[PDB]
Structures are given as structure tokens and as C-alpha cells.
Design an enzyme around this catalytic site. Structure first.
Site, short mmCIF file in Angstrom:
data_model
loop_
_atom_site.label_atom_id
_atom_site.label_comp_id
_atom_site.label_asym_id
_atom_site.label_seq_id
_atom_site.Cartn_x
_atom_site.Cartn_y
_atom_site.Cartn_z
N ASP A 288 0.86 -1.18 0.00
CA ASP A 288 0.00 0.00 0.00
C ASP A 288 0.90 1.23 0.00
O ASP A 288 1.54 1.51 1.01
CB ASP A 288 -0.92 -0.02 1.24
N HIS A 289 0.94 1.97 -1.12
CA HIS A 289 1.79 3.15 -1.28
C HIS A 289 1.35 4.35 -0.43
O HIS A 289 2.10 5.32 -0.34
CB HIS A 289 1.87 3.58 -2.75
N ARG A 290 0.16 4.30 0.18
CA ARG A 290 -0.29 5.38 1.04
C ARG A 290 0.50 5.42 2.36
O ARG A 290 0.56 6.47 2.98
CB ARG A 290 -1.79 5.27 1.31
#
Ligand SMILES: [Ca+2]
Lengths: 375, 254
Positions: B215-217
Site C-alpha cells: 500500500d503506497h499510502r
């Protein structure tokens, strides 16, 4: 900032394909088998009736036969009246990346579909492929051809790109990204004689981006395994040789013989004489092709029996005065014997007692004879 | 065009979950690890266990254990992005529950793929971990898994390499910070045609293409890149196998 017009259609399709949750299974397949088999296919076709098989012909055909094994690979997700219904198309139409070089250099990349592939044999498939190719090349494709792509194939490996992760549009279940059929980056610096002597072969990095709504990782992973089994199978090439009118035994995926060149040499010397004694017994001299087993019922002519593999094909052997040369590659040796004895002229010259007569026929038979003039 | 549109029922649950993963911006770090060490160590582990008290260690046992110990080093790998009252808050779970891709071959051949969870892995030694793994395996195999087992997956692991697929770019589901895609542990495509005697004489070994989609968040390329480096350090370490041999009752040097 230039507003897109015709290309805007392509832009809207990228935005439409965003609702599709995709994932990509990638797998490397050794291609040394279909490379060495294409060698024979295009040589035999050239010497009999024309026609040329490219690597994509074999690739697309295997995709079509693997689609029959996995049905969920042809289907595509759709929503009908707010329901998660998956379309199951009647015909498996293989979409092709055909780049049409336009009038003013405009490389118009089209997706032509070969239709009713599931109801086809290797002959019918390549006939429908070459129709779609001949017509795309001369701008005679109907709009109906572009409508119906259920499953597709792209080749980023044309430009040397090892593998790609494609983006999957709506209406399709999955799209296979055939990688670059080549030797890996590390080996690119070593000599060919070094590589073939160890047993390293070219490979294709076959990818498969699929819809994760309907197709799951296991099905797509097994689909690529199935394609691998075909590209290295023996019955797959047996079927292809039957459809292409080749009566000879196709190359088989065999793992390198760990014997030395001296040990392998006496086998290759003996195999040459075996092809001279009974070249006629496995030749295509029967025009009616009544006994199809005569081609396969001979171990004295089968190379795999004489302790040899497709890896030994590019190695040199001290063949005492075979084609005049005291040293020759195995694939050259088996090509002289094929065209000299197992083609349409069976030769019984070994049973003669006079030696110069045998020497005489050897020169007039084991030479690449000139094709007769058109006159 | 002579087509059949079937409405999804049980599989419809899977379809709506793939839609939820669309909001998760995913990127994948891929890394190849030589496995010749854990292969030759497994040789001794399963032979010693067979000659003393039973038990068998599979490659996934070692793989999952290294994932769990690496999660301790990188804390942001267990966390998952969430929005609480319109705020970008990231959940930090108390227990690192490793998700297992368990394919349950059903009554009529229906391969029901489930995501069981080995819980409280961070508070475990190699023995306690493989005990909790084999409980979740024995119960999944005989359909005795509680619904409580499927709720709590903080970090998952899939094995596309089972079917020979070299590496995969998996899709990450909501509620998970990262999901690891264990590649096919094998010799590369080019070598497949050479003799074994040729390969071992040069020094070429089998390898696993370990992937990591996250998850790049919350997780960034550097953290996920280092997480896979850490796993590689373990799979070729000496103290990692020293600890495992101690837990498995093997007195000899690994
Ligand atoms: Ca390589």
C-alpha cells in the site's frame, strides 16, 4: 497542449479499463525447442510448396489450445442490470497486435481477431491468421474483424523488452504479453561456442495480465504452465508436423548428454553410415503416404537413440570426410543426410562391392544440389 | 453472440473485494534469492526429524517465519491505511497475523481458496510458529476452521510459484499493509536443458523470485526494498538456521 481526436478513442479506453482490477503472472519458458523445430519447418516448406511459420504462429496456436483447457480464460466480467454476470463467448477470438504503417508514416496499431479458433487444427488456424495478416497489410480489414476480441496477444519482445506488464481493457478476460525470445543479459558477452558447449538456451518471458474479478492467480498460473508444457511437448510438434505435411520426426526436448565429444564422435560417425545403409527406409518416396509408421519405426536413424540431444546440434564433430569437411556441426550433418537420403530419393548404394562406385554416388548425393532453372 | 451470462452468488463476494482493492495504490518490489542454502538445510531437517520423532518442514515454514521476524524489524509493514472520520489514520495492529493461501479441495472438486491467519506471530519462536501453522493447516484441511480465523489478516503471503510461475504481481486487498508473492523456487529457464553434473560443477543454484506488493499510502519503495533485503539476509544467514536447529532439536551444525 494539443487536443486528441482519433487517439482520444484510445485515451477513453485506458480510462474505461481502469475499473478492471488486474494482476500479472510471469513465467520464463526455454525456447530452444521451437527454435530448432522452426529450422526444419521453414526449410521443408521452402523446398516443397512455399509458406513460412513464424514464432507467433506456434505461440498463438498454443494459446488457443490452452484456452480450451481453461474455460474461464476466454470469459470476461460484465454487469447486466446491476448483476455480476460473466459473459462466456461462443468463439475464442485471438486479438493480434498488428502495426499498420500508414500513408504518411502513421503507425496505426490495430487489434485484428482470428475467429472460431477453438474449432481449428494447426492448418486452419494459420490459414485464418494469414488471411487477417494479408488483409491488414493491404488495408482491406472490415470493421467486423475488430469487434469480438475475447482473449488477446501482444509482443513487446519485438523491441528486445524482456517482459511487460500490460494494462487489460474491458471486454477481455486476459491478455498474454509474450516476452523477448533471447539469451539473458549476463550471457550476452560470452562466445556462442562457450554457451552451446554448456547447454544454455534462449528463453521467452511469457506474461499474462488477467482480470482478478473472475480469473484467480491459480487459474492464470496453471494456464501459463499449460502453455509451457505445449511449447516443450512432443505430441504438440507431432500434430504441427502432420498439419504442415512434414513426415519426419520433430525435435524433442531432451536435457544435454553429459558425455565428452570423443565419446559422442563415434556415435555420430556410426549414425552417418546408418543413414547411408537405410536412407530409403525412412524417405518420403510413397506418394500415397499409406504407411505413416515407416518414418518413426527406425532407431538406427533416430538421433536421440545415438546418445544425442538438440544441445549437441551446434557442436563440432570429427566426421571423417562426410561433406568433404573433416569437421561439421550436428545440425548440418543431419540436414545433408535428410536432403540426400530421407527426402524423395532412397539410395541403396552401400551394398555394391566396388569402392569407387560408392565414392561416386556419395559425391553426387551428399551435396546441396542446385534448384533447377525456371526454363 | 451465443453467450451465457451467469449471476455470481458466493463468488460475487470475491468480485466486490477486488473492487475495494482498486482504491489501494499498489507498487511491487521484486527480488531473486538463491535458495540452495535452505534446500540443503531442509535435506538435514526432514531426515533428522524422520529418524527421531516425525514431523516435516516445508519451504513455506521457513519462508513465513522469516516474514514474521522481518515484520518485527520493519513496523510499517504490518500497518494498513484507513480513514476514520475523514482523517488519514493508519491502523497499527497489536498482533502480526500472517495470511496463508490455503486451497481447500472441496467435496465436488471445488477448490475453495481461503485466507487463514496464524495469530500472535511476533510473540513466537520457530517452534511456536510452526505449531500454530500446522493447527491452522490441519483444521483447514478437515473443514474445522472458525470464522474468527479469517478475521485479522494484517500481512498476507501467496505462492504462485507452486504452479511454476516464476514471479507474480499480485493485487493487495484492503485491511492489509503489504502482501508477499513467493515465486517459483527453481533453476532459470536457460539452464533447464543442461545436465545436473554440469550445473553443480560450475556452482549454479536454484532461486526464488520473492515479490512484495504494498500500500503506497503508508509504505514506500525504500522500506519495501529493505524488507525484501532483510528476508534475503535471513534465508542465507547462519544464526537464522542456528535458531531453527535449536528449536527443532537438531544439535549438529547447519
Ligand atoms: Ca537469468
Amino acid at each position: 497542449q494539443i487536443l486528441r481526436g482519433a487517439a482520444a478513442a484510445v485515451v477513453k479506453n485506458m480510462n474505461a479499463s481502469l475499473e478492471v482490477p488486474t494482476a500479472t503472472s510471469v513465467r520464463a519458458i526455454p525456447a530452444k525447442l521451437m527454435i530448432d523445430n522452426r529450422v526444419v519447418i521453414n526449410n521443408h516448406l521452402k523446398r516443397t510448396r512455399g509458406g513460412k511459420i513464424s514464432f507467433t504462429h506456434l505461440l498463438g496456436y498454443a494459446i488457443v489450445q490452452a484456452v480450451k483447457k481453461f474455460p474461464n480464460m476466454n470469459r470476461h466480467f460484465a454487469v447486466v442490470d446491476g448483476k455480476p454476470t460473466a459473459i462466456t463467448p461462443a468463439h475464442t477470438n485471438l486479438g493480434l497486435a498488428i502495426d499498420l504503417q500508414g500513408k504518411d508514416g502513421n503507425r496505426s496499431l490495430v487489434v485484428a481477431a482470428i475467429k472460431r479458433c477453438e474449432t481449428m487444427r494447426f492448418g486452419q488456424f494459420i490459414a485464418a491468421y494469414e488471411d487477417i495478416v494479408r488483409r491488414a497489410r493491404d488495408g482491406k480489414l472490415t470493421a467486423e474483424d475488430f469487434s469480438g476480441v475475447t482473449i488477446s496477444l501482444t509482443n513487446p519482445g519485438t523491441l528486445g523488452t524482456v517482459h511487460s506488464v500490460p494494462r487489460l481493457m474491458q471486454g477481455q478476460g486476459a491478455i498474454i504479453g509474450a516476452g523477448a525470445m533471447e539469451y539473458p543479459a549476463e550471457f550476452q558477452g560470452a562466445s556462442e561456442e562457450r554457451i552451446a558447449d554448456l547447454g544454455i538456451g534462449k528463453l521467452i518471458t511469457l506474461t499474462s495480465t488477467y482480470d482478478h474479478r473472475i480469473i484467480q492467480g491459480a487459474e492464470s498460473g496453471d494456464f501459463l504452465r499449460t502453455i509451457h508444457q505445449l511449447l516443450l511437448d512432443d505430441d504438440f510438434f507431432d500434430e504441427i508436423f502432420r498439419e504442415l505435411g512434414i513426415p519426419y520426426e520433430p525435435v524433442r526436448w531432451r536435457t544435454d548428454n553429459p558425455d565428452s565429444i570423443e565419446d559422442k564422435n563415434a556415435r555420430v560417425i556410426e549414425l552417418i553410415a546408418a543413414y547411408r545403409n537405410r536412407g530409403h527406409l525412412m524417405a518420403d518416396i510413397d506418394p500415397l503416404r499409406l504407411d505413416n509408421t515407416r518414418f518413426r519405426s527406425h532407431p538406427d536413424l533416430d538421433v536421440n537413440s545415438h546418445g544425442l540431444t538438440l544441445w549437441d546440434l551446434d557442436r563440432e564433430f570429427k566426421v571423417d570426410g562426410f561433406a568433404g569437411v573433416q569437421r561439421k556441426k550436428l545440425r548440418d550433418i543431419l540436414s545433408v543426410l535428410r536432403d540426400a537420403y530421407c527426402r524423395h530419393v532412397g539410395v541403396e548404394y552401400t551394398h555394391i562391392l566396388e569402392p569407387e562406385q560408392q565414392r561416386w554416388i556419395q559425391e553426387r548425393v551428399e551435396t546441396k544440389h542446385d534448384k533447377p532453372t525456371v526454363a | 453472440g451465443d453467450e451465457s451470462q451467469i449471476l455470481r452468488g458466493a463468488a460475487a463476494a470475491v468480485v466486490k473485494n477486488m473492487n475495494a482493492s482498486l482504491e489501494v495504490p499498489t507498487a511491487t518490489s521484486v527480488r531473486a534469492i538463491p535458495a540452495k542454502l535452505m534446500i540443503d538445510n531442509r535435506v538435514v531437517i526432514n531426515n533428522h526429524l524422520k529418524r527421531t520423532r516425525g514431523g516435516k518442514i516445508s519451504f513455506t515454514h521457513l519462508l513465513g517465519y522469516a516474514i514474521v521476524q522481518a515484520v518485527k524489524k520493519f513496523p510499517n509493514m504490518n500497518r494498513h491505511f484507513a480513514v476514520v472520520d475523514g482523517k488519514p489514520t493508519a491502523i497499527t495492529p497489536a498482533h502480526t497475523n500472517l495470511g496463508l493461501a490455503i486451497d481447500l479441495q472441496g467435496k465436488d472438486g471445488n477448490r475453495s481458496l481461503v485466507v487463514a491467519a496464524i495469530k500472535r506471530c511476533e510473540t513466537m519462536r520457530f517452534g511456536q510458529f510452526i505449531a500454530a501453522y500446522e493447527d491452522i493447516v490441519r483444521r483447514a484441511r478437515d473443514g474445522k476452521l472458525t470464522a474468527e480465523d479469517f478475521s485479522g489478516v494484517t500481512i498476507s503471503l501467496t505462492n504462485p510459484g507452486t504452479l511454476g510461475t516464476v514471479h507474480s504481481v499480485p493485487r493487495l486487498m484492503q485491511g492489509q499493509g503489504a502482501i508477499i508473492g513467493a515465486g517459483a523456487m527453481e533453476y532459470p529457464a536457460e539452464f533447464q536443458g543442461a545436465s545436473e553434473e554440469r550445473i553443480a560443477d560450475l556452482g549454479i543454484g536454484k532461486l526464488i523470485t520473492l515479490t512484495s506488493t504494498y500500500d503506497h499510502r503508508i509504505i514506500q519503495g525504500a522500506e519495501s526494498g529493505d524488507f525484501l533485503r532483510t528476508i534475503h539476509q535471513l534465508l542465507l544467514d547462519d544464526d537464522f538456521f542456528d535458531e531453527i536447529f535449536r528449536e527443532l532439536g537438531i544439535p549438529y551444525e547447519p
